[PDB]
Ligand binder design. Structure first.
Ligand SMILES: *[C@@H]1O[C@H](CO[C@@H]2O[C@@H](C)[C@@H](O)[C@@H](O)[C@@H]2O)[C@@H](O[C@@H]2O[C@H](CO)[C@@H](O[C@@H]3O[C@H](CO)[C@@H](O)[C@H](O)[C@@H]3O)[C@H](O)[C@H]2NC(C)=O)[C@H](O)[C@H]1NC(C)=O
Ligand SMILES: C[C@H](CP(=O)(O)[C@H](Cc1ccccc1)NC(=O)[C@H](N)Cc1nnn[nH]1)C(=O)N[C@@H](C)C(N)=O
Ligand SMILES: *[C@@H]1O[C@H](CO)[C@@H](O[C@@H]2O[C@H](CO)[C@@H](O)[C@H](O)[C@H]2NC(C)=O)[C@H](O)[C@H]1NC(C)=O
Ligand SMILES: *[C@@H]1O[C@H](CO[C@@H]2O[C@@H](C)[C@@H](O)[C@@H](O)[C@@H]2O)[C@@H](O)[C@H](O)[C@H]1NC(C)=O
Ligand SMILES: [Cl-]
Ligand SMILES: [Zn+2]
Length: 607
């Protein structure tokens, strides 16, 4: 560790703790910078030499975290919990938490190499047909989205899960043991306990379950309606009206968003076509247009534009040269208050437009809290950060807004059009809920030891069937590691944040619409050009993690807890309509033939 980056001396009392805290933050910026920079170089240009530089950069950050971590515990361990300043207790609480830096050197290197290898495996895996091979993004993504051929979709689903999942498994086991070993020395029973403590709610798991119970009837009804629509296209052989849906027929590799099958489920096809992708293609929209249009929504609210550094630095398309990259969208803060970037392999579609807004939301957060102490540059909780861009995307997807931006010529205000719109949004928002809830339930069980390696896939599919009511379209066994085929698992980044954001964003939407002075139905609200709504959103963004998230929420929304009510209110019309339709069609809500799997196509796997 470079001498400048090492800690000096401070008094062993609260007043000393304040100075320790101030100096820690000054040094940390450079170490965060070189780390993030080394990660960028690798993720935008995957090579062994860049991977090695990233591993070296991570080692340095562990050195840093060790020096300052041990210093905080040297001075403050028996006394920091009774400190009078609660904002101090949060940083000294953090700095005394070493994480992987608790590992001896050889295991640090093993830990860093594992993250590097798992990430490379997920992002360079391919499905080969003969000579040629498909990558996840764009090739397999476009197949899952626009093929309606049962066999083709199955070849893509099976291919990807095998390519990514199988080689990840032995590495994921080693990672889990090293991860737990590290956080066990910080006082947590396991890494999962550490991840949960970010929400600082002693009753987090029960609060989540009580939320899910309110939402589950909305999913069951969406599920049944959709299952019926599929049965009409695929037939009685491949779809069971009383069983789970095959996991490859919902438009998405993880069946996590159902937006791509909108055309099969749209109840009133004679109204305006709310999927706007084909108009985007016809008009010749490119990535740059999508980002500029996103930016302009932000600036309409009197929030910040993207700085020159973002446009010069960002990667907005998959590289055309001979270069491999991590294609999973991501937003980047370099912790120097100047450099902020998005890395997205942007495709020209309506959902990608929402994703552009999603990522730009992360950046806008960075732009607003950049003058705060580096430790306070986070969301109020991780769910806040994930909700910002989605909030705006709610206004952007409205037919009234799509008209303003030239993507929809008709603009009708009738109950059939509302049901079309609300159903489309449910395919994106309601269909995600079960998946968003289950990923970290799986991962928490793995970290606790409840799910050992011999049950990784057993317990994944139990949860997948339990919550989503889907089944794998081919037989799986414990050699498969289907969880590993989802980005966030091998990239070791938590998921519960997405479930929290899909609820929170409707709470934000309701409050910003009210502040904008908007009076009609909540699902028709567009906050475009509302400076008042902007000022309110800005207060949350500039606060960072300096105050408890319960208080930040209260000031914005009037409530100090997560609440499903605004989401229910938003969807109320289609919730009532879907119930009615399923009764009238004699549907069964749920999948009581839980053991059912579809047969293989006759010529599997040829074509
Ligand atoms: C789409 O249409 C709805 C419904 O509009 C209402 O019913 C229709 C059948 C017609 O008869 C309309 O003339 C009638 O307004 C619109 O929602 C409605 O918007 C109005 C005005 O924004 C709301 O009236 C307000 O009510 C509040 C009290 O909550 C008062 O403070 C205000 O003074 C104001 O009068 C009305 O509540 C609202 N209706 C419902 C059921 O929520 C909607 O605006 C329209 N959408 C678009 C994009 O034009
Ligand atoms: C499209 C979005 C990408 P994201 O912006 O949340 C992406 C996911 C990710 C996480 C770690 C490494 C690399 C990427 N998150 C980010 O880029 C940011 N670092 C999130 C952030 N949080 N605080 N500051 N920044 C995402 O993954 N969405 C969920 C719903 C999904 N598609 O499963
Ligand atoms: C991808 O990364 C490699 C390093 O892994 C970069 O290659 C270096 O480029 C510089 C300047 O052009 C040379 O001086 C080095 O000798 C190169 N290293 C190697 C191992 O070849 C490369 O520039 C990166 N590509 C892009 C587009 O950024
Ligand atoms: C797990 O399954 C592996 C491959 O899958 C099998 O073959 C495919 C083509 C399907 O038809 C399906 O029935 C089978 O699952 C096997 O090679 C492997 O032996 C299995 N693993 C164990 C431990 O038995
Ligand atoms: Cl999280
Ligand atoms: Zn995100």
């Amino acid at each position: 560790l470079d001498p400048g980056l090492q800690p000096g001396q401070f008094s062993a009392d609260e007043a000393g703790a304040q100075l320790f805290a101030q100096s820690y933050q000054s040094s940390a910026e450079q170490v965060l910078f070189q780390s993030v920079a080394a990660s960028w170089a690798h993720d935008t240009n995957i090579t062994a030499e860049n991977a090695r530089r990233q591993e070296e950069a991570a080692l340095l950050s562990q050195e840093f975290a060790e020096a300052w971590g041990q210093k905080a515990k040297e001075l403050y361990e028996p006394i920091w919990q009774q400190f009078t300043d609660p904002q101090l207790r949060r940083i000294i609480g953090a700095v005394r938490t070493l994480g992987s830096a608790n590992l001896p050197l050889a295991k640090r290197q093993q830990y860093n190499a594992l993250l590097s290898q798992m990430s490379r495996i997920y992002s360079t895996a391919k499905v080969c047909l003969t000579a040629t091979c498909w990558s996840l993004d764009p090739d397999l993504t476009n197949i899952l989205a626009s093929s309606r051929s049962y066999a083709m979709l199955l070849f893509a689903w099976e291919g990807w899960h095998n390519a990514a999942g199988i080689p990840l498994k032995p590495l994921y086991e080693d990672f889990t043991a090293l991860s737990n070993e590290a956080y066990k020395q910080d006082g947590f029973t396991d890494t999962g306990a550490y991840w949960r403590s970010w929400y600082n709610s002693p009753t987090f798991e029960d609060d989540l379950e009580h939320l899910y119970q309110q939402l589950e009837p909305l999913y069951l009804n969406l599920h049944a309606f959709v299952r019926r629509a599929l049965h009409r296209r695929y037939g009685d052989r491949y779809i069971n009206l009383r069983g789970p849906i095959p996991a490859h027929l919902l438009g998405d590799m993880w069946a996590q968003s159902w937006e791509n099958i909108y055309d099969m489920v749209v109840p009133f096809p004679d109204k305006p076509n709310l999927d706007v992708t084909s108009t985007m293609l016809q008009q010749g929209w490119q990535a740059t247009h999508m980002f500029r249009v996103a930016e302009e929504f932000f600036t309409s609210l009197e929030l910040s534009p993207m700085p020159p550094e973002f446009w010069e630095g960002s990667m907005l398309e998959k590289p055309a040269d001979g270069r491999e990259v991590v294609c999973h969208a991501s937003a980047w803060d370099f912790y120097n208050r100047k450099d902020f970037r998005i890395k997205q392999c942007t495709r020209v579609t309506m959902d990608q437009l929402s994703t552009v807004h999603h990522e730009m939301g992360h950046i806008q957060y960075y732009l607003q809290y950049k003058d705060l102490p580096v430790s306070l540059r986070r969301g109020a909780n991780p769910g806040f950060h994930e909700a910002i861009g989605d909030v705006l995307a709610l206004s952007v997807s409205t037919p009234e807004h799509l008209h303003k931006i030239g993507l929809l010529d008709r603009v009708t205000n009738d109950t059939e059009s509302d049901i079309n719109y609300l159903l489309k949004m449910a395919l994106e928002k309601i269909a995600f809920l079960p998946f968003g809830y289950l990923v970290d339930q799986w991962r928490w069980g793995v970290f606790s030891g409840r799910t050992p390696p011999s049950r990784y896939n057993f317990d994944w599919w139990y949860l997948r069937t339990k919550y989503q009511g889907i089944c794998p379209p081919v037989t799986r066994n414990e050699t498969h590691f289907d969880a590993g085929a989802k980005f966030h698992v091998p990239n070791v980044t938590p998921y519960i944040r997405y479930f929290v954001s899909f609820v929170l964003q409707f709470q934000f939407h309701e409050a910003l619409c009210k502040e904008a002075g908007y009076e009609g139905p909540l699902h028709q609200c567009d906050i475009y050009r509302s400076t008042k709504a902007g000022a309110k959103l800005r207060k949350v963004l500039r606060a960072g993690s300096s105050r408890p998230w319960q208080e930040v929420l209260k000031d914005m929304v009037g409530l100090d807890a997560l609440d499903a009510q605004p989401l229910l209110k938003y969807f109320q019309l289609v919730t009532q309509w879907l119930q009615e339709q399923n009764q009238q069609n004699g549907e069964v809500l749920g999948w009581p033939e839980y053991q059912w799997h579809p047969p293989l196509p006759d010529n599997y796997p040829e074509g």
